[PDB]
Amino acid sequence: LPSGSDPAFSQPKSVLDAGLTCQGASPSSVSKPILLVPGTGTTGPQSFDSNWIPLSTQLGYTPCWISPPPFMLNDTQVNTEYMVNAITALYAGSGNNKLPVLTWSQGGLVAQWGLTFFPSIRSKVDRLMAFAPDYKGTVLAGPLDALAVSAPSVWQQTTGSALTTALRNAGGLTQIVPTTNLYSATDEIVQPQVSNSPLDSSYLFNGKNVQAQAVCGPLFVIDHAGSLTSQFSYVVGRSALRSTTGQARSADYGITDCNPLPANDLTPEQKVAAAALLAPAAAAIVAGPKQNCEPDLMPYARPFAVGKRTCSGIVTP
Numbered sequence: 152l153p154s155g156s157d158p159a160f161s162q163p164k165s166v167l168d169a170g171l172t173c174q175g176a177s178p179s180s181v182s183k184p185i186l187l188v189p190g191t192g193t194t195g196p197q198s199f200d201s202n203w204i205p206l207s208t209q210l211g212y213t214p215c216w217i218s219p220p221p222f223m224l225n226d227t228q229v230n231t232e233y234m235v236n237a238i239t240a241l242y243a244g245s246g247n248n249k250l251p252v253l254t255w256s257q258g259g260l261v262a263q264w265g266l267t268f269f270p271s272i273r274s275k276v277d278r279l280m281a282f283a284p285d286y287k288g289t290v291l292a293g294p295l296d297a298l299a300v301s302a303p304s305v306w307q308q309t310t311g312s313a314l315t316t317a318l319r320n321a322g323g324l325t326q327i328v329p330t331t332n333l334y335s336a337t338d339e340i341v342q343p344q345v346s347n348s349p350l351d352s353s354y355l356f357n358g359k360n361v362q363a364q365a366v367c368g369p370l371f372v373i374d375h376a377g378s379l380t381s382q383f384s385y386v387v388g389r390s391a392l393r394s395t396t397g398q399a400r401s402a403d404y405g406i407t408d409c410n411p412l413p414a415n416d417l418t419p420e421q422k423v424a425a426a427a428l429l430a431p432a433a434a435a436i437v438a439g440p441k442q443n444c445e446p447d448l449m450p451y452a453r454p455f456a457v458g459k460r461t462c463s464g465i466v467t468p
């Protein structure tokens with residue numbers, strides 16, 4: 152795993168600062184913050200307004216989020232800078248206290264990419280609660296890449312990409328901070344997710360990998376968005392956030408919790424929105440940038456994906 156000093160940011164600090172926002176507070180003076188890293192094709196609010204923003208508030212946290220432009224569709228390496236900058240700011244803004252990081256979809260990949268290549272944040276992140284993370288990308292994006300209808304981050308989240316290869320070879324497939332991965336075998340966006348073993352895209356060695364079906368049975372069905380908004384997910388997430396170990400405890404949830412519908416504590420209005428979470432994301436992807444090649448890896452990541460091909464050609468150290 153990489154060690155030492157953090158790589159330089161490619162973006163100006165003021166640009167990175169503009170992507171961070173906290174509910175009812177400034178990042179420089181926030182109490183018990185929680186960083187929410189959104190999914191592909193959405194902004195912080197679009198990913199969490201109907202779920203984890205109000206739910207984390209009810210848990211005693213001040214929700215904060217990053218909204219990398221445009222809609223998390225650009226280079227994942229850049230989206231991560233927003234997160235690293237956010238952590239640095241929220242940590243100092245909370246009296247130098249570690250803070251939890253909750254994520255959805257691509258947001259998990261960004262968190263892990265950050266913990267792997269940016270050593271400084273490893274002592275600033277308390278725990279990681281990842282919902283439907285795609286550390287190994289997804290095989291379902293291959294076809295889209297071939298037609299060149301994929302955004303920069305879709306190329307990178309494709310199984311076999313230079314980005315996912317660089318993460319694996321750098322040792323990013325092992326948890327770096329206490330991590331809880333809640334996913335579903337019936338995820339229509341991320342695959343493979345059916346083996347309930349290291350082959351799954353949301354699996355991290357030494358982490359609390361929770362495949363919903365392994366707990367609720369083969370008849371339990373929650374999709375990509377469901378992995379984030381379901382009552383089952385709220386219970387597992389609450390467990391992860393409260394745990395003294397930093398990971399979700401099996402003793403905190405059981406079959407009773409196997410409710411595929413949105414979290415009970417959500418207002419009926421928030422429930423309807425949470426059920427249609429994927430709608431805005433699909434819209435953003437249809438209207439967003441599209442290209443015919445995977446974005447070039449930044450210098451700090453090239454040594455780990457030699458031989459792979461990106462927009463400029465073959466990768467060399």
Ligand SMILES: *[C@@H]1O[C@H](CO)[C@@H](O[C@@H]2O[C@H](CO)[C@@H](O)[C@H](O)[C@H]2NC(C)=O)[C@H](O)[C@H]1NC(C)=O
Pocket residue numbers: 161162219220221225226229446
């Ligand atoms: C989207 O990602 C690209 C690729 O990382 C960013 O472009 C780079 O930006 C830096 C800083 O401005 C430049 O020094 C590089 O030359 C750019 N590279 C390329 C290939 O364009 C871009 O800034 C990001 N845009 C947004 C809105 O996040």
